[PDB]
Design a protein around this ligand. Structure first.
Ligand code: HEM
Ligand SMILES: C/C1=C/C[C@@H](/C(C)=C/c2csc(C)n2)OC(=O)C[C@H](O)C(C)(C)C(=O)[C@H](C)[C@@H](O)[C@@H](C)CCC1
Length: 403
């Protein structure tokens, strides 16, 4: 049950020695600063995802009151968003939007994503320094979500800001060390919600064929299928959930291929392996700092612990995914392995709706960059930060065509 310090300097860069220590010594421990139990092993993590004794709604938490008062601008999003809705409401909302996120539906986005990837590399690949985060990955995910929502590129920076702020603001009162000023967070959240109201009112005015937002609006207008608050919360969550995560995937992919020349040469030789490799990036080195949370609906015993009702539980994803009893050679980056058991996109009713979008964006972004600059080399050690949810890479400086 030893030493868990996920905000220590060095942890985001390389958390694996620390959490192997934890995982090898115990399946469960109490994280005093996080005020919650932490589960360290694959099977325990996997099960809790599907186990209905554990809720997602933060309203089940013993500290619900404190959490709901924090960032009142986000109260609606917390009550009516995908995490807060009761299971039958959650199923309903998911049944509605899931069709818009399949591989086939998101395939339409392919040309716009490639165009964005093309102009980012055109506009900045000429200087000495190329920052894979600042100059590349950062400009991609919002373009994608905005194409899916049919929002003009001029609004991209406002929504990205909103997405990233919202993801952090939702941590305030929930997770220990949100690394930003409230007033700044709150302003980006406010402005973003305003922008969103305008996007939605325009779409109701000018509804479109084969369009996610119009479909959601048309469901809201007809007999009870989606409330206005559910709808707004849903679009807001999609923007916030899909912004930073994908930035980190793309960056961690490039990093991990630069670090493993063998893996890269394999993906060069069989471009069809790119999809598996991107899944193995998340498996071998998951972008999450700690993981995700659940809340005990009732007192119960679990892996030798007496968990009380309302107590929070963290699933230590990056640990579970190095669990040697499920993955062979868990500590090797192997782009040929079977990655089916990866929990990186969740399991159960709350399984990530954006998985096909994240994979498409990253295949295009990571594929393109290595095809057009095959001899790319890391110019320096990646700089990591203190995002409360993510092992966030702030910069990843490389040399595209090295002398
Ligand atoms: C590689 C990037 C991504 C990762 C690793 C990821 C991971 C996850 C995970 C693990 C969950 C479940 C969390 C839990 O059960 O507590 C989830 C839920 C979610 N993800 Fe993703 N996601 C990613 C990208 C995206 C994108 C691009 C979108 C765009 C819409 C998205 C939208 C969502 C939403 C809305 C939920 C809530 C689902 C629900 O509660 O029903 N994600 N994601
Ligand atoms: C990868 C990941 C992204 C989901 C995204 C988010 C805010 C989703 C969502 C749906 S409805 C709603 C209000 N939000 O959530 C995030 O990007 C970060 C979370 O907002 C905060 C609350 C900061 C966290 O640390 C949590 C515990 C985070 O690590 C878990 C939830 C991450 C796995 C899911």
């Amino acid at each position: 049950a030893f030493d868990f310090k996920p905000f220590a300097p060095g942890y985001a860069e390389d958390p694996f020695p620390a959490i192997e220590r934890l995982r090898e010594a115990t399946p469960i421990f109490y994280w005093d600063e996080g005020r919650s139990w932490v589960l360290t092993r694959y099977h325990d993590v996997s099960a809790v995802f599907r186990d209905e004794r554990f809720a997602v709604s933060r309203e089940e938490w013993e500290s619900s009151a404190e959490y709901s008062s924090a960032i009142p601008e986000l109260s609606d999003m917390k009550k009516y968003g995908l995490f807060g809705l009761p299971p039958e409401d959650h199923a309903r909302v998911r049944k509605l939007v899931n069709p818009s996120f399949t591989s086939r539906a998101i395939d339409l986005l392919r040309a716009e994503i490639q165009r964005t990837v093309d102009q980012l590399l055109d506009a900045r690949s000429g200087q000495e320094e190329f920052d894979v985060v600042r100059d590349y990955a950062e400009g991609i995910p919002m373009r994608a979500i905005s194409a899916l929502l049919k929002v003009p590129a001029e609004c991209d920076e406002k929504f990205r800001r909103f997405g990233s702020a919202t993801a952090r603001a939702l941590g305030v009162g929930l997770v220990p060390r949100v690394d930003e000023e409230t007033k700044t967070l709150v302003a980006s959240v406010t402005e973003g919600l305003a922008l969103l109201h305008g996007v939605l009112d325009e779409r109701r005015r000018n509804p479109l064929e084969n369009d996610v937002l119009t479909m959601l609006l048309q469901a809201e207008a007809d007999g009870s299928r989606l409330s206005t608050k559910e709808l707004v919360a849903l679009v807001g969550a999609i923007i916030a959930a899909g912004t930073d995560t994908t930035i980190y995937l793309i960056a961690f992919a490039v990093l991990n291929l630069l670090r493993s020349p063998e893996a890269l040469e394999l993906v060069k030789a069989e471009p069809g392996l790119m999809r598996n490799a991107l899944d193995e990036v998340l498996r071998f080195e998951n972008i999450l700092r700690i993981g995700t949370v659940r809340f005990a609906r009732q007192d119960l015993e679990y892996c030798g612990a007496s968990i009380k009702k309302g107590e929070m539980v963290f699933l230590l994803i990056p640990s579970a995914l190095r669990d040697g009893t499920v993955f062979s050679r868990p500590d090797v980056f192997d782009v040929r392995r079977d990655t089916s058991a990866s929990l990186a996109y969740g399991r159960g009713p709350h399984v990530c709706p954006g998985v096909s979008l994240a994979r498409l964006e990253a295949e295009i972004a990571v594929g393109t960059i290595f095809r057009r600059f095959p001899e790319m080399k890391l110019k320096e050690t990646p700089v990591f930060g203190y995002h409360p949810a993510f092992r966030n890479i702030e910069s990843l400086n490389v040399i595209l065509k090295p002398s």
